[PDB]
Amino acid sequence: ALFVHRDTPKNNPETPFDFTPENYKRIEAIVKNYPEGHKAAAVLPVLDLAQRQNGWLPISAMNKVAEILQVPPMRVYEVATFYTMYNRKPVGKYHIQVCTTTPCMLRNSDSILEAIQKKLGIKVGETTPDKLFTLIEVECLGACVNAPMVQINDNYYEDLTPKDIEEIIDELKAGKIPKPGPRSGRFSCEPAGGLTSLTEPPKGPGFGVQAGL
Amino acid sequence: VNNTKKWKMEFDTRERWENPLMGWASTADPLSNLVLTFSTKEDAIAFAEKNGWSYDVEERKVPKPKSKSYGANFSWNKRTRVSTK
Amino acid sequence: KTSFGSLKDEDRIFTNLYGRHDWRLKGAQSRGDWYKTKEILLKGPDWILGEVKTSGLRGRGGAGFPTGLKWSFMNKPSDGRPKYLVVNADEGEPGTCKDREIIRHDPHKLVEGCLVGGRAMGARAAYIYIRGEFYNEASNLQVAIREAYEAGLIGKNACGSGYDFDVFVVRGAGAYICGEETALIESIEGKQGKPRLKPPFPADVGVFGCPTTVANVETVAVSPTICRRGGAWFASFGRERNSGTKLFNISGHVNNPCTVEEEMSVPLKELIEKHAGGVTGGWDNLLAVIPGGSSTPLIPKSVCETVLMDFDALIQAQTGLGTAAVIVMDRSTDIVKAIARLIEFYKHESCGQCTPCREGVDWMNKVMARFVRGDARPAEIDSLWEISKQIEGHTICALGDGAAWPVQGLIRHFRPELEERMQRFAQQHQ
Numbered sequence A: 001a002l003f004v005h006r007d008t009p010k011n012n013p014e015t016p017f018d019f020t021p022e023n024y025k026r027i028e029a030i031v032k033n034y035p036e037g038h039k040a041a042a043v044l045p046v047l048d049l050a051q052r053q054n055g056w057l058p059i060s061a062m063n064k065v066a067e068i069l070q071v072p073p074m075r076v077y078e079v080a081t082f083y084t085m086y087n088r089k090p091v092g093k094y095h096i097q098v099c100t101t102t103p104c105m106l107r108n109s110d111s112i113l114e115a116i117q118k119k120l121g122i123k124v125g126e127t128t129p130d131k132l133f134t135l136i137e138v139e140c141l142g143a144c145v146n147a148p149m150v151q152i153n154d155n156y157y158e159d160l161t162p163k164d165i166e167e168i169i170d171e172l173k174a175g176k177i178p179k180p181g182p183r184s185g186r187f188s189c190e191p192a193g194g195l196t197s198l199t200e201p202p203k204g205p206g207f208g209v210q211a212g213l
Numbered sequence B: 001v002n003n004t005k006k007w008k009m010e011f012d013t014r015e016r017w018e019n020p021l022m023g024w025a026s027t028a029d030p031l032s033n034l035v036l037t038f039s040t041k042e043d044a045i046a047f048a049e050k051n052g053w054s055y056d057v058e059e060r061k062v063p064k065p066k067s068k069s070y071g072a073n074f075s076w077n078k079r080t081r082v083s084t085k
Numbered sequence C: 001k002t003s004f005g006s007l008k009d010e011d012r013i014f015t016n017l018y019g020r021h022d023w024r025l026k027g028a029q030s031r032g033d034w035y036k037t038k039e040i041l042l043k044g045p046d047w048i049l050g051e052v053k054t055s056g057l058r059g060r061g062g063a064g065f066p067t068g069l070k071w072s073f074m075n076k077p078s079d080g081r082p083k084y085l086v087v088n089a090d091e092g093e094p095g096t097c098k099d100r101e102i103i104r105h106d107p108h109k110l111v112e113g114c115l116v117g118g119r120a121m122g123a124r125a126a127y128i129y130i131r132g133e134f135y136n137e138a139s140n141l142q143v144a145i146r147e148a149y150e151a152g153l154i155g156k157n158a159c160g161s162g163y164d165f166d167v168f169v170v171r172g173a174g175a176y177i178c179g180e181e182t183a184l185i186e187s188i189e190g191k192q193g194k195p196r197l198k199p200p201f202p203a204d205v206g207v208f209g210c211p212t213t214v215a216n217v218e219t220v221a222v223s224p225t226i227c228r229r230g231g232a233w234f235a236s237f238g239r240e241r242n243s244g245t246k247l248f249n250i251s252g253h254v255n256n257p258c259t260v261e262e263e264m265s266v267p268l269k270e271l272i273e274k275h276a277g278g279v280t281g282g283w284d285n286l287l288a289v290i291p292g293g294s295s296t297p298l299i300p301k302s303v304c305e306t307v308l309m310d311f312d313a314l315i316q317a318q319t320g321l322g323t324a325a326v327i328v329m330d331r332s333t334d335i336v337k338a339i340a341r342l343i344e345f346y347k348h349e350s351c352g353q354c355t356p357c358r359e360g361v362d363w364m365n366k367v368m369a370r371f372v373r374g375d376a377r378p379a380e381i382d383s384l385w386e387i388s389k390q391i392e393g394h395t396i397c398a399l400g401d402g403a404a405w406p407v408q409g410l411i412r413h414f415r416p417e418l419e420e421r422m423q424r425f426a427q428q429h430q
Ligand SMILES: NC(=O)C1=CN([C@@H]2O[C@H](COP(=O)(O)OP(=O)(O)OC[C@H]3O[C@@H](n4cnc5c(N)ncnc54)[C@H](O)[C@@H]3O)[C@@H](O)[C@H]2O)C=CC1
Pocket: C059, C060, C061, C062, C063, C064, C065, C070, C073, C090, C091, C092, C093, C096, C179, C180, C181, C201, C202, C214, C295, C296, C320, C322, C323, C397, C398, C402
C-alpha cells in the first residue's frame, strides 16, 4: 500500500532474481513485437513475465527488467507502482480478487466477501498463514452481467453464491484447480432462462453479401 | 515577470558593520536604500547625468523566443522523446 | 421505420456471441468470417472508407465519434513513419462486459476487422491492447491469431492480396485509464498510462509517434460485416445518425443479466423486459438506470419509460449512451451508496496527471462518503455540483468528465433523498 521502497532482507537489490533461459526466449519474442529503437515498450510484458516466474516483484526483477531492456530503473519503478497487478509484496499462492464495484455490489458481492473472510479467517488485504490465499478487493473486472464474481490468478469465477465460493476455496485447498466459469446454470453471458436471441442457426459464408464483391 | 518591466537606478553598496550593542547592521551610506524607477533606459540616463552621478548601464535581457511542441515529446526517431510523463 | 428493436438473428453481426459455436477458424469460416476478404482488400482503402462512412458507424468505444470520418484521417500519404491500427480491448468500464465476449467468442471476426481496418487506414500492424485481467481471452485471441497466420489470412501476403499486416496482442496490467486512447498509447510504449494532451491527435502522433488510429473492439469487428453486407444494410437500422446494431450489457437488478445484440434505437423498457426478464420485482420496482456504464449519468424511472437506447435520444435525456451498459437499480437500492462506490472507483482509477481529477475526484469521494451517512449539511450539495463543474472540461481526458457526471446525475434526480439522509442524520446525532 506504500509507494516508496525500503530495503528489507527479503526485498533488496541483492535479492536473487534472474530469468530462466526459456523466459529469455520469451523476452526475445516480446521485444520483437515492437519497432527497433523502442525496446522500452516491452517494459510492461517482461515485468509481468518477471511476476509470472517469481510470483511477485522484488527490487531485482525491476532492476533486471531495467537492465535487459536498457531503460533507467526509475522508468521501471513507475510502471511497477502505476499498475495494480504488479505485486511488490509476496502474495499467497491464490490471489483472490473480489470485485465490489456497483454492478457486482448490486448483486451482493458483500455476501461473498464476507463468506471468503469467514472461510479463510482473514480480512481484505491479509494473507492466510499458510501463504495460500491473499484476499483483496478490486475494481471492475469486466464480468458485469456475471455479477457477482471473483478472479483467482488467471481465472474468473462467476455468478457466485457464498456456497459456491466456499466450494471453490475447498477444492483450491485440496490441490485441484476449479473450472473458470459461471457457477449458475448458464454458460458464459446468455440470459439464464433460455436464450432470448441467437436461437437460429448461423447463416454461413456468403449470406447477404452485396453485389460487386 | 512583472518585476522585469521597469528600469532601476541603484548605487554601489558601501560598508555595513556590526553594531557593538545589538549586532544590528549599522551604515554610513545615505544612498544605501535609494532605488529609483524609470520607464525607459534614456530617462534613467538623463536623470543620472542631470544629477552628476557617474553611471553604468546594463542592457535589458529578454528571454528569447522558444520553440515549443507538445508532440515533440513523442517523436518517432528524435532524442527529444520523454521517457516519462 | 418508426419502431426499433426486435432484431432478427439473420441480422446479427456477432453470431456466436454466447459461446455456443466453435470460436476457432473452422467455426468462424462457416459463420461468414474471412469470406472474400481478398476481394475486400483489393478494392483499396477508399472503397472501405466509403463503406464505413456510408454505414453511419459511430465509435462503439463510448464516445460515438463517426468511425469513417475518424479512419479517413489516416488516409494521407506517408512520410517515413509506419502507420498503426491499435485496437482498444481494455474495457474497464463498470457495467461493460461486451468486448470480452467478442474476444472470447468471435476472435477471428476481430482479426478480420483488424485487417480490413488497417488496410483502410494503410496501417502496417495491429496492436490489440487487451486488458491484463482478460488472460483467458487474450490467450484465446492469440490462438485465433495463430490460426490466422497459419491460414495465410494475416502477415506476409495477407489473404493473397499482397498487403503485409501483423496483428499483435498487448496485455494491460490493471489500469482503467489505459482504455483511454492516448493513455493506452503510452501504456503500449512502456510508460505509465497517462493520457497525452490533444492535439496531437493519434493520427498525427500516436503509438511510437507514428500515425495511429485507436478503435474499439466492437467498431472494428463489425467492419468486415459492413464491407460484405453493404453500408446501406448497416445504415438501415436505428434512427438517423444512430445507425446499426449494438451490444448491450444489462446488469444489476434484472432477472436475467445478459449481453445481447440489439437494434440501435430500441426502447430501454423493451430491452429490459425482453432480453433481461424485466426489473426484479417488475417494472414498477425500478428506481434508476445508469444507461451506458459508470460514466453516464443515471436516469430515473420516469425517463426510462419512453427513451430510446441510441446516442441522440440519451443526450436529449441529459445522459449519454456511452458503452451501452445498462445498470438497473431497483427501489431497494441505496442509490447514494452506489454512486459513492462509483466515485470511489473513479478515484482508485485515476492516473494522477492533471490537477482537477487528482484532487477533485478524491474530494468528491470524501464528500460522497459523507453523503452516504448523511454527515453533511444541504449547502454542500450545491458546492459538490460546482466541484463537478470545476472538473468537467478542465482535465486532460474524459475520466474527469466521467467522474463529474454520476455526481451530477445523482444530484439532479435525487437531491431530496440526499436531503432526507442529511436531516435524519442531523436529528439522530444532534
Ligand atoms: N468503452 C469503455 O470501456 C469506456 C468508454 N468511455 C466513453 O469514452 C468517451 C470519452 O472518450 P474520449 O476518447 O475522450 O472521447 P472523445 O472526446 O475524445 O473522442 C472520441 C474519438 O474521436 C477522436 N477525435 C475526436 N475529435 C477529433 C478530431 N478533431 N480529430 C481527430 N480525432 C478526433 C478521438 O481521438 C477519439 O478516438 C465517453 O463517451 C465515455 O462514456 C469511458 C470510459 C470507459
